[PDB]
Structures are given as C-alpha cells and as structure tokens.
Short mmCIF file of C-alpha atoms and ligand atoms in Angstrom, two decimals:
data_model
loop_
_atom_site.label_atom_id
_atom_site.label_comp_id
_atom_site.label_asym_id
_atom_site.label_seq_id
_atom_site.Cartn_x
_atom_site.Cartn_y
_atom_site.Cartn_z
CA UNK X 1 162.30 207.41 6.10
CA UNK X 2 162.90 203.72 5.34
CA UNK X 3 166.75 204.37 6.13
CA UNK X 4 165.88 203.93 10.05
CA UNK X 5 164.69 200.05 8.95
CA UNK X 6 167.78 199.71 6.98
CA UNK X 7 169.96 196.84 8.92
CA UNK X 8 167.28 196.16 11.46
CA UNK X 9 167.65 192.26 10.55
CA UNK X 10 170.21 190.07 12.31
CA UNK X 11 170.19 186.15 12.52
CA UNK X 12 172.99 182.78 12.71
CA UNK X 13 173.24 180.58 9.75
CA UNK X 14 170.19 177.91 9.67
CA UNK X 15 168.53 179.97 12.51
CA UNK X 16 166.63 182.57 10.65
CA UNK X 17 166.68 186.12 10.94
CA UNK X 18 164.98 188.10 13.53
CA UNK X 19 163.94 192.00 14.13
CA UNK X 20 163.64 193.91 17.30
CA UNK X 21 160.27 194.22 18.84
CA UNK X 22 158.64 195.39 21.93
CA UNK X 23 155.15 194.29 23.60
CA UNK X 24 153.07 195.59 26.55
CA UNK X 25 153.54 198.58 28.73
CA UNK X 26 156.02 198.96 29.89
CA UNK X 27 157.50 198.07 26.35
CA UNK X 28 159.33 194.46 27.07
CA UNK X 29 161.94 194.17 24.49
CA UNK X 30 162.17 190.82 22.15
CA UNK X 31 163.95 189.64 18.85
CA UNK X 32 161.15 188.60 16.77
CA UNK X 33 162.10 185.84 13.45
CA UNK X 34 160.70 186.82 10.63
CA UNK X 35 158.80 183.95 8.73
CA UNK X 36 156.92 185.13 5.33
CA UNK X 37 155.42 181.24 5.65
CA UNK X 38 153.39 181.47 8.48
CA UNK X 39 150.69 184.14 10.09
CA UNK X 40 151.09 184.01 13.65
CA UNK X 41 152.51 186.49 15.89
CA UNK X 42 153.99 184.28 18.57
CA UNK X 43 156.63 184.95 21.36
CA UNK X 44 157.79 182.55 24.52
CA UNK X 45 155.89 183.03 27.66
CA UNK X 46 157.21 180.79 29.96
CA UNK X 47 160.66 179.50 30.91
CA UNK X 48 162.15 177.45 28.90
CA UNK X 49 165.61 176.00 28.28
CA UNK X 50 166.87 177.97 25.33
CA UNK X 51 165.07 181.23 25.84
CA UNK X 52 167.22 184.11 27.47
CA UNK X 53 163.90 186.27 28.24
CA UNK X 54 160.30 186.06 27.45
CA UNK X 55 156.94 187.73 27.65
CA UNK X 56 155.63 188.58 31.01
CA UNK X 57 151.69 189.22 30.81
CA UNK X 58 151.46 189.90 34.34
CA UNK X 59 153.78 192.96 33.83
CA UNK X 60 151.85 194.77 31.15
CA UNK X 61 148.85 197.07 32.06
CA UNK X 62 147.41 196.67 28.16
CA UNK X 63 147.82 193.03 27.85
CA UNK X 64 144.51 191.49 27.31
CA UNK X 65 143.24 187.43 27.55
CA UNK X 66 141.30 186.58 25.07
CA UNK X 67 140.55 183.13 26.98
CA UNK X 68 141.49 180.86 23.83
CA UNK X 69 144.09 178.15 23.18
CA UNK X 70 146.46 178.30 20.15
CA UNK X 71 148.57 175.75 18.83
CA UNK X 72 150.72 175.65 15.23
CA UNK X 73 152.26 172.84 13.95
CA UNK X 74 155.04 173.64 11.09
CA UNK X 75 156.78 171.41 8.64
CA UNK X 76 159.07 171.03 11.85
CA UNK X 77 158.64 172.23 14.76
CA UNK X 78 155.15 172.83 16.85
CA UNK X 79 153.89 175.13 19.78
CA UNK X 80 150.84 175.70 22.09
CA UNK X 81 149.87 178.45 24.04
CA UNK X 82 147.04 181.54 25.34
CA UNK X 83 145.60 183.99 22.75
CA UNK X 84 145.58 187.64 23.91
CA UNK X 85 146.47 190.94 22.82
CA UNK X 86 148.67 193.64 23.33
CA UNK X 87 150.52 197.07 22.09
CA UNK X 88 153.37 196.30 20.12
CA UNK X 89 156.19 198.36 18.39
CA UNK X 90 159.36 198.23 16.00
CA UNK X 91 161.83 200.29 17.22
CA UNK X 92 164.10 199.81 13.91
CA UNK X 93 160.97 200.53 12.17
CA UNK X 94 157.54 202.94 11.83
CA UNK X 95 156.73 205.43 14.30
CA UNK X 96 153.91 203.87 15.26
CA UNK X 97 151.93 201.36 18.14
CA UNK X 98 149.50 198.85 17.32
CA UNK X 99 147.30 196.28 19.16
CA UNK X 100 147.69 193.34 18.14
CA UNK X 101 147.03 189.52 18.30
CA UNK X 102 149.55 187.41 20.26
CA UNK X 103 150.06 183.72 21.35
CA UNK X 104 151.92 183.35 24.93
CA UNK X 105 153.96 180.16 24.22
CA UNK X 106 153.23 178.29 27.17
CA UNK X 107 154.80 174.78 25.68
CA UNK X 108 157.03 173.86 22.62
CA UNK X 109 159.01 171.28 20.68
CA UNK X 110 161.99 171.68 18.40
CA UNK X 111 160.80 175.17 17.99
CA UNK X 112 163.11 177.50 20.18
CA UNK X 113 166.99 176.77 19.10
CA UNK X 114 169.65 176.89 21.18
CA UNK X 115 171.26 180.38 21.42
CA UNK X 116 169.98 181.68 18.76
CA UNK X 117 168.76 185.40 20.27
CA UNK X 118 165.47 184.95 19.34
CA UNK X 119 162.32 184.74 21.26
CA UNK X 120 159.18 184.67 19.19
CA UNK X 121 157.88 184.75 15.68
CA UNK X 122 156.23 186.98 13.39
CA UNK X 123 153.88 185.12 11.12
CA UNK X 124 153.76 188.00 7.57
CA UNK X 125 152.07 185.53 5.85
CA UNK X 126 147.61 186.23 4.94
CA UNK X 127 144.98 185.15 7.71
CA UNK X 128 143.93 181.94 5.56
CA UNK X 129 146.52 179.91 7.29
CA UNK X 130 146.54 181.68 10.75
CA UNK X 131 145.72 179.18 13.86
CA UNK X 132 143.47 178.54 15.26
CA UNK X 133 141.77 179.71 12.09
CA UNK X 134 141.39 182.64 9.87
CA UNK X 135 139.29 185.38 12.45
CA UNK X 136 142.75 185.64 14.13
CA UNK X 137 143.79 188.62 12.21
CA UNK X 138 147.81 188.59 11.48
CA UNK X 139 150.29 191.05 12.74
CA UNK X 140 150.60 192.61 9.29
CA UNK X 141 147.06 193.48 8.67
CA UNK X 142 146.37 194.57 12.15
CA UNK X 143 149.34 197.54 11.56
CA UNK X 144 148.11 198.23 7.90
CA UNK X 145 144.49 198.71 9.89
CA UNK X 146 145.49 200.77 12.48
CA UNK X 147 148.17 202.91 10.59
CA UNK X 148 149.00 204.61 7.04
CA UNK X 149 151.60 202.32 6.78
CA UNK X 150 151.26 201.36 3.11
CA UNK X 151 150.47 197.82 2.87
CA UNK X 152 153.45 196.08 1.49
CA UNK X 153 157.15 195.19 3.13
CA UNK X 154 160.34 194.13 1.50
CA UNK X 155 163.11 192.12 2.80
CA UNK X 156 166.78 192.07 1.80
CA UNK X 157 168.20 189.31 3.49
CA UNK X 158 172.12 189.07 3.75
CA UNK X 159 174.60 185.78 4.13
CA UNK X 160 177.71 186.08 5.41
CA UNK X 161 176.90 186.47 11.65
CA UNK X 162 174.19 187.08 8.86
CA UNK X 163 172.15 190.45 8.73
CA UNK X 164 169.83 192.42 6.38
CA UNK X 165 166.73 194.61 6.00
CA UNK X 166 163.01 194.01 6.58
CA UNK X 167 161.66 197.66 5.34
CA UNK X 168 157.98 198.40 6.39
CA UNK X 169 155.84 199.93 3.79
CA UNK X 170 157.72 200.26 1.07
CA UNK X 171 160.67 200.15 -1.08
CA UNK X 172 164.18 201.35 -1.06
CA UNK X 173 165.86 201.71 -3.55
CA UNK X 174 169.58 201.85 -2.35
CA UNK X 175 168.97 198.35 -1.26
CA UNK X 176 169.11 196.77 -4.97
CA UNK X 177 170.22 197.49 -8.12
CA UNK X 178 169.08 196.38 -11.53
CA UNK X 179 165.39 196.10 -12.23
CA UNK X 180 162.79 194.76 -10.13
CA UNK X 181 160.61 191.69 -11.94
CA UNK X 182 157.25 190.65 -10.67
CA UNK X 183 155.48 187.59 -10.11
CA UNK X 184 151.93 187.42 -9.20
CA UNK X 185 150.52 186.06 -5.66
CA UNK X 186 148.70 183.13 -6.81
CA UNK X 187 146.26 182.87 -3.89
CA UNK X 188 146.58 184.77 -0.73
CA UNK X 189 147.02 182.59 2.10
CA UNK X 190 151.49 181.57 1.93
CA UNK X 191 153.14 183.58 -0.40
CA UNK X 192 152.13 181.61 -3.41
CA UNK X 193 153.66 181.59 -6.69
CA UNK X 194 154.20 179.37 -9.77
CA UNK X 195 157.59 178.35 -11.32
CA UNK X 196 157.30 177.83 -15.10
CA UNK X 197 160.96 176.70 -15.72
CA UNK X 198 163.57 175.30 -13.96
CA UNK X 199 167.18 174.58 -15.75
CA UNK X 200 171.06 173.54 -13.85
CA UNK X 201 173.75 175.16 -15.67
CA UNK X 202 171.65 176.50 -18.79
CA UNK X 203 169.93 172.76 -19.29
CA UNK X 204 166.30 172.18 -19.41
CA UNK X 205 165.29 169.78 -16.34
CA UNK X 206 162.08 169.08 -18.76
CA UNK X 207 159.43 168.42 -16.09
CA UNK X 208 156.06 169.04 -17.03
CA UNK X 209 155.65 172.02 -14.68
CA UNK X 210 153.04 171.11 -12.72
CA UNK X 211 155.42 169.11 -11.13
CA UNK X 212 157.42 172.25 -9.68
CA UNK X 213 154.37 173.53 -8.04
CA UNK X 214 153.05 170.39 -6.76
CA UNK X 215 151.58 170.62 -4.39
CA UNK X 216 152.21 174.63 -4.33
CA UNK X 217 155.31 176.55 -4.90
CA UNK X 218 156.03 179.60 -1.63
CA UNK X 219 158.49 182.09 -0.65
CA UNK X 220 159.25 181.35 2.48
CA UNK X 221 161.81 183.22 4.78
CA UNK X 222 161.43 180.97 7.78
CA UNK X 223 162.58 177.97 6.49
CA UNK X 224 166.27 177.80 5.71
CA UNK X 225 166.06 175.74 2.58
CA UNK X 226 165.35 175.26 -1.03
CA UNK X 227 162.51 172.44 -0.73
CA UNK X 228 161.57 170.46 -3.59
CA UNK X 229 158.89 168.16 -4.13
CA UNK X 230 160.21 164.81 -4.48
CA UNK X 231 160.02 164.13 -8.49
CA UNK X 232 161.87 167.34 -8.77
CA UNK X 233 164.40 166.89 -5.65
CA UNK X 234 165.34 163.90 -7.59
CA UNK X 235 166.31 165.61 -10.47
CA UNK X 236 167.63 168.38 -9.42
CA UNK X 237 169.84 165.98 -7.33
CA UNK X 238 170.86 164.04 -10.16
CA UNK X 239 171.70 166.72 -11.97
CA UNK X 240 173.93 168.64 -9.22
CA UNK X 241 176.19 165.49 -8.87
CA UNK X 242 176.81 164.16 -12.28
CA UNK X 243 178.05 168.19 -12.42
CA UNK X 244 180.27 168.01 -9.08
CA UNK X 245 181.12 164.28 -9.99
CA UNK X 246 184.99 165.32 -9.84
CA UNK X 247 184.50 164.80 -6.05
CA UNK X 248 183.26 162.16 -3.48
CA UNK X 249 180.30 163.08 -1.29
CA UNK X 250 179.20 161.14 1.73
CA UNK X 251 175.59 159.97 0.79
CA UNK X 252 174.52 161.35 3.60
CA UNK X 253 175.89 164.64 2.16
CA UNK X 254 173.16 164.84 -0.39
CA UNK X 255 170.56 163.87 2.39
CA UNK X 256 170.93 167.41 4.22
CA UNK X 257 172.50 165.02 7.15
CA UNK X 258 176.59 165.13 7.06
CA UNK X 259 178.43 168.29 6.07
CA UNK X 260 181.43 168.73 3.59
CA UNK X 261 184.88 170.95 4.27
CA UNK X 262 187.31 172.13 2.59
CA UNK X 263 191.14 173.87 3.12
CA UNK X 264 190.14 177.26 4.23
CA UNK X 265 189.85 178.84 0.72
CA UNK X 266 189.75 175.57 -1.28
CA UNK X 267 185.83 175.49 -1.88
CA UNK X 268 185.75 174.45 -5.78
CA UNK X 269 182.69 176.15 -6.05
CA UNK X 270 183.27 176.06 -10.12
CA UNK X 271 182.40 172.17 -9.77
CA UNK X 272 178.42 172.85 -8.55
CA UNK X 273 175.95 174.60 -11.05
CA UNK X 274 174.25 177.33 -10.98
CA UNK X 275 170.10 176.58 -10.68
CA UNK X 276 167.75 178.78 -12.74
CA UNK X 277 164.07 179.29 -11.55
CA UNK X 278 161.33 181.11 -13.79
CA UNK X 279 158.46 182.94 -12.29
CA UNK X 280 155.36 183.76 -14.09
CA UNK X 281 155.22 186.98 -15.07
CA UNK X 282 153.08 189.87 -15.18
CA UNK X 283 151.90 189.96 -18.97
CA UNK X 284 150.97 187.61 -20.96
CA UNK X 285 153.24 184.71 -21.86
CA UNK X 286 156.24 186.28 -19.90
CA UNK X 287 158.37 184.76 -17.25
CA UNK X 288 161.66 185.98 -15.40
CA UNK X 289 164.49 184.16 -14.07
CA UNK X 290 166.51 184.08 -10.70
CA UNK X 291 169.27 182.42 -10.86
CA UNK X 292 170.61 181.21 -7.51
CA UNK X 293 174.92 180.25 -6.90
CA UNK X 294 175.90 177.50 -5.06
CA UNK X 295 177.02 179.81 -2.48
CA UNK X 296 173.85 180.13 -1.55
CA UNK X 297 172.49 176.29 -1.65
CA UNK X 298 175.59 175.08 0.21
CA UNK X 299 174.94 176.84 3.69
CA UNK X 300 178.32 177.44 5.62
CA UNK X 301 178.34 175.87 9.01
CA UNK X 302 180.88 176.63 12.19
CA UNK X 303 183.26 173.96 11.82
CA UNK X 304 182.32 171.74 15.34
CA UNK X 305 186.10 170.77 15.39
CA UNK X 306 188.88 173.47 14.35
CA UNK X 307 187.91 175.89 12.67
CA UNK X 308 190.61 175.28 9.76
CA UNK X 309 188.44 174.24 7.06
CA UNK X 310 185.49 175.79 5.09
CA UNK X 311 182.41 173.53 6.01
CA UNK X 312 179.02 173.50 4.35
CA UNK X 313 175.44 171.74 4.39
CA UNK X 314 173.44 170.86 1.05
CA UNK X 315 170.49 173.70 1.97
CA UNK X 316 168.48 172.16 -0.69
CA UNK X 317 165.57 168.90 0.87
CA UNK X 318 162.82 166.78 -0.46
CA UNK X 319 159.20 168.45 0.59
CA UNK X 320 155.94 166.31 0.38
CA UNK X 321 154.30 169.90 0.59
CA UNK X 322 155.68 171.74 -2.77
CA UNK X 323 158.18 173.99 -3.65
CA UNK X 324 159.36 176.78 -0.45
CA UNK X 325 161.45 179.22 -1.78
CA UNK X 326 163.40 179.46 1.34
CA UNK X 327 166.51 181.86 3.12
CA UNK X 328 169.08 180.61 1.73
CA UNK X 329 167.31 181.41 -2.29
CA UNK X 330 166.08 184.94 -0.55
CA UNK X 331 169.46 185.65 0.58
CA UNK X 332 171.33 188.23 -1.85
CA UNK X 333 167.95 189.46 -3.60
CA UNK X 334 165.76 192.16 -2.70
CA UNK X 335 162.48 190.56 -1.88
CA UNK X 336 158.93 192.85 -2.25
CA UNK X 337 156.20 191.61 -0.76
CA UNK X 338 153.88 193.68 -2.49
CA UNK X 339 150.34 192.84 -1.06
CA UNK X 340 148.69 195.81 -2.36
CA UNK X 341 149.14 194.87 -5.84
CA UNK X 342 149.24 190.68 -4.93
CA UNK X 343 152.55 190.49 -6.23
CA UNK X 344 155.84 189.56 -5.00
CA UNK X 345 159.15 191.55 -6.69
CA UNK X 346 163.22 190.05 -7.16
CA UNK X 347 165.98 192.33 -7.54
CA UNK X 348 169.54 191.81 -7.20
CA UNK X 349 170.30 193.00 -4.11
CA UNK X 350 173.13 195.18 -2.36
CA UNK X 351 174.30 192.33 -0.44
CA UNK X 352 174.40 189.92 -3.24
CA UNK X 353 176.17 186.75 -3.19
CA UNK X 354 179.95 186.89 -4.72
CA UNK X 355 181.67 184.60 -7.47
CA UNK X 356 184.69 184.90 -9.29
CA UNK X 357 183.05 184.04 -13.13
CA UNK X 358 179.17 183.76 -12.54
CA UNK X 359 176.86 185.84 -10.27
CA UNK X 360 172.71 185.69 -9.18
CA UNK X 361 170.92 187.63 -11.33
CA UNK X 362 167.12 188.60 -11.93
CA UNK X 363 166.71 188.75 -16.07
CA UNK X 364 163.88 189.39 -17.98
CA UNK X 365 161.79 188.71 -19.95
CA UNK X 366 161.37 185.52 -21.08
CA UNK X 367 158.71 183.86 -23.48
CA UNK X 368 156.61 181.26 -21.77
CA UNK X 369 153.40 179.91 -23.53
CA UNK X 370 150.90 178.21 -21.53
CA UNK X 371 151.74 179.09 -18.07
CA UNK X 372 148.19 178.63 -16.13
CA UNK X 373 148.92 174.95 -16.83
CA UNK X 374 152.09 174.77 -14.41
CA UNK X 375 149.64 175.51 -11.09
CA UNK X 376 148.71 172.79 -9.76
CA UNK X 377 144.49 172.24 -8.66
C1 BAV O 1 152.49 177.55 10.24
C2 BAV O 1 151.75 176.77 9.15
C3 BAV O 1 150.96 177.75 8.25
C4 BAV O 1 152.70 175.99 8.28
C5 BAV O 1 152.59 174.59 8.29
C6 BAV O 1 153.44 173.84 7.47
C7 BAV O 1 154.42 174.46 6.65
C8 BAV O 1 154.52 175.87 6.65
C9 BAV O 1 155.57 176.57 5.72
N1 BAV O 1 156.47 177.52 6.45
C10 BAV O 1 157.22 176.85 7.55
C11 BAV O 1 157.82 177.88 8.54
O1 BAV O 1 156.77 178.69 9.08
C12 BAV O 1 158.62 177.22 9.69
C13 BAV O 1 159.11 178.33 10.64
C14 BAV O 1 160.07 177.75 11.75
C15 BAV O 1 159.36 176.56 12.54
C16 BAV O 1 160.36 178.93 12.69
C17 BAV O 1 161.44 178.61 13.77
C18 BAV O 1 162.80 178.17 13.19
C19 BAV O 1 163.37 179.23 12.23
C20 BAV O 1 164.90 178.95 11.98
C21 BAV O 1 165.18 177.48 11.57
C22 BAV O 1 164.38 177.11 10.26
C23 BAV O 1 164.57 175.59 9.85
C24 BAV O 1 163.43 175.27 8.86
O2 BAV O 1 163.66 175.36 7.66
N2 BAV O 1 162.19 174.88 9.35
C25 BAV O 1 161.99 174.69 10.82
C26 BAV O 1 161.12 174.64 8.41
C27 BAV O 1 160.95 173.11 8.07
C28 BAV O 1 159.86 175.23 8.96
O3 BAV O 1 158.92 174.50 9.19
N3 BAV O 1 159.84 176.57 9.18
C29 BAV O 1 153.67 176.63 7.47
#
C-alpha cells in the first residue's frame, strides 16, 4: 500500500523537502527534511527565531534522556543538543511506531531557514557517519529493526511550491517509467557511488576519473546542489559558458552568488548544455548514464523585486569534499535507495523535468573498461 506515501513530500526551492512526522505521546506533529547525506534524526527543541513549533520533552510520557550531548557540523550549517529517545510515526507512511534515537536541538547556526515549514531532520544515511559516533543507531535501521518494513526507500523528488514522494519499503512503480539502472553502494556510510564518465553536450570532459570521485562521489538529497570537486567544477564551468557564450553573465553568476532573469517566458534554455553523468554499473565493464537539463542546474528563485521576470541561481558549486549528487540532479528521477542489495537505482520519473527538444533520461548500458580505477583510496 505504497499509494498512502505517494505525495507525502513537500518543500520551497533551495530549502529541501520535508515529510510529516510525529514524536512522543501524545503524538506532537513535525515536518521532518529529508537528507540521504546525513544519519541523524534531529528536530528543534527550544525556541528559536525561525521555528513555528518544536519538540516538547516535558510533554511526552515515552520520551527518554539518554544524558549525552550531540553536536553535527555539515558542509554548512551546525547544531548541538540532548540525546534521548522516543516513539515516532509517519502518518503519510507505514502503519507502524518505533523508538527511536533523537537529538533535542537545544542551539543552532545557519541550520533552521526562515519559513521554510520545517522543524527537524531525518538523517537516511548508514550509522558510520552518525554523531556523536556510530553506536547511535539511525532512524532507518531502528524502523527496519523493529518492523517488517523491507529495508530499502525510494524517493521521487519533484521541481516546480516543490513536492514529491519518499516511499518506505519499497518501490512503486507508477512513480517512473522506463527502466530502472543500478549502481552499486561503494561503502556504506553516505550514499557512495563512483562516476566513470562525465560529458556536456555529448563531449568527453576527459578527466582521469579519479578526479570525479575525489575525494568521494554521494547522493545527497539534503543539499540543494550539484557539487564538484574543484578540478572538475572548473571544467565543467568552462565548458557551460563557452556553450551559453551568446549571453553576458555577472561573474558572480557562475559563483552561485548573483542570480540571472529573464522576460517571463524568455529563458533560452537551448543556449546551456545538457551534463551527462555515468555510474558504474552492475556487471562487469558496464556503466549507465543520467543525463541532467539545465532546468534542473539553474534553480528558479522568487523574483525579490516584481515578479515579472523568470529568475534563476547556477545550482551547480565547487566542493573540497567530492562529488554530492544533490536535489536539484534527484529532482525528476526516481531515486531507490536499495540498502538490502547496497545499491542505489535511477529511473525517469513521473514528475520529470520538461524541454521542448531534449529531455533527462536514464540509458543503458554502456561499455566502460577499468572502472575500479575511478574510486578514489
Ligand atoms: C552530517 C555529516 C555526516 C556531514 C558533514 C559534511 C557533509 C555532509 C554531506 N551532506 C550535507 C547535508 O547533510 C546538509 C544538510 C543541511 C545542513 C540540512 C538543512 C538545510 C536543508 C535545505 C538547504 C540545503 C542547502 C545545502 O545544500 N546545504 C546546507 C549543504 C551544504 C549541506 O551541508 N547540507 C554530511
């Protein structure tokens, strides 16, 4: 009955997407974000500017103190608070309670966002990288314990205000069409995979491919970008303009920093390629593509003036960390996160991203010959 998860996702542009959950008894209701690139369960528990409601301990008859500080520090962004448990539920999703770990957010910075609707996060990713360390067993693997809920999830997320699916334990299939192609888990701690080939409109970038997984290459729905390390930023940068070099972009354009408009409906998305990225496969010497539009690396923001021209934000930044296969790639494929079988599936999905002569795809397969070599060690 995966149709009752269907459309349990909702989120703003550049502020994630979150899912309805409830904690304690009585049940305290709380929009969760879902982040595939971290493994903490995590809500606010304390006043704070930007949050409309948070978790009250002292109002739950289950809620338990484990008497130990927690802090996580992401990419950007950072939090500190009490370790406890408690029983938690998803009403847009199984019939079923679970106790599980949570951090009380006692005191943050640049985490919350301004009206976004969201009040906490769940962390899908494995236990290596859970804080304080890995005994703090994740969300994910608590339910999996404690329930038949098979252990696996998929998420379709949707652009344009944006919305989608997160289904747990298992698959549906009226959320994608095409076939679904597989790329193994590399290590179980993020969501790690390994790109084998990257190419801008059909041309070879011609890294060696290390370089695309260097340091490591993640899917990652909690970060809204495409993040590059900087060798391949560089080129991928390059590349983009020289294509789009009909038009003048503020430097600060290509920096992530200043955002571009257009007359409403005057977007010449023709002028920006179209960026291919190959996944290792699950036989020998095969690979699979995504190919991602640039309606999905040029992120549509409210216009702060009037709202008479079509603005956007380059959604793709330099990492020093590797490759994260952020929202905005996510967004318009069906993501499985199949943990069960340490892979992770692509599928064009249901909501997928609209062009008048090109459009994302998932094709397969490709021939790729020495494809160990591209992870990095
Ligand atoms: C938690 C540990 C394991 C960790 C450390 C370092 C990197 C990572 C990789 N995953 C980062 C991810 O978990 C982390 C999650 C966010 C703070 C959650 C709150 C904001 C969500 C909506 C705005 C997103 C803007 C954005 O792209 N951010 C905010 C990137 C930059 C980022 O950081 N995201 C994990």
């Amino acid at each position: 009955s995966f149709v009752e998860m269907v459309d349990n996702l909702r989120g703003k542009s550049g502020q994630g997407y979150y899912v309805e959950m409830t904690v304690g008894s009585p049940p305290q209701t709380l929009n969760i974000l879902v982040d595939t690139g971290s493994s903490n369960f995590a809500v606010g528990a304390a006043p704070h500017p930007f949050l409309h409601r948070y978790y009250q301990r002292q109002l739950s008859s289950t809620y338990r103190d484990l008497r130990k500080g927690v802090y996580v520090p992401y990419t950007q962004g950072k939090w500190e608070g009490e370790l406890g448990t408690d029983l938690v539920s998803i009403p847009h999703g199984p019939n079923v309670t679970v106790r599980a770990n949570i951090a009380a957010i006692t005191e943050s910075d640049k985490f919350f966002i301004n009206g976004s609707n969201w009040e906490g996060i769940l962390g899908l990713a494995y236990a290596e990288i859970a804080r304080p360390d890995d005994s703090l067993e994740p969300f994910f693997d608590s339910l999996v314990k404690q329930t038949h809920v098979p252990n696996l999830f998929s998420l379709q997320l949707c652009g344009a205000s944006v919305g989608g699916s997160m289904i747990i334990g298992g698959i549906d299939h009226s959320l994608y069409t095409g076939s679904l192609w597989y790329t193994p888990i590399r290590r179980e701690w993020y969501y790690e995979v390994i790109i084998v080939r990257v190419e801008i409109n059909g041309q070879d970038l011609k890294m060696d491919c290390k370089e695309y997984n260097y340091d490591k290459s993640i899917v990652d729905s909690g970060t809204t970008n495409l993040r590059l390390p900087k060798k391949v930023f560089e080129a991928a940068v390059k590349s983009i303009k020289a294509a789009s070099s009909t038009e003048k972009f503020p430097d600060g354009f290509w920096l992530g920093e200043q955002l571009v408009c257009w007359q409403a409906g005057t977007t010449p998305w023709n002028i920006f390629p179209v960026i291919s990225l190959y996944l290792m496969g699950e036989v020998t010497n095969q690979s699979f593509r995504i190919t991602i539009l640039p309606q999905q690396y040029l992120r549509p923001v409210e216009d702060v003036a009037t709202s008479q021209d079509d603005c956007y934000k380059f959604a793709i930044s330099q990492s020093s960390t590797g490759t994260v296969m952020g929202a905005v790639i996510m967004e318009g494929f069906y993501v499985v996160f199949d943990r069960a079988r340490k892979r992770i599936g692509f599928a064009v999905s249901a909501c997928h991203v609209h062009d008048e002569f090109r459009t994302a795809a998932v094709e397969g397969p490709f021939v790729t010959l020495d494809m160990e070599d591209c992870g990095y060690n």
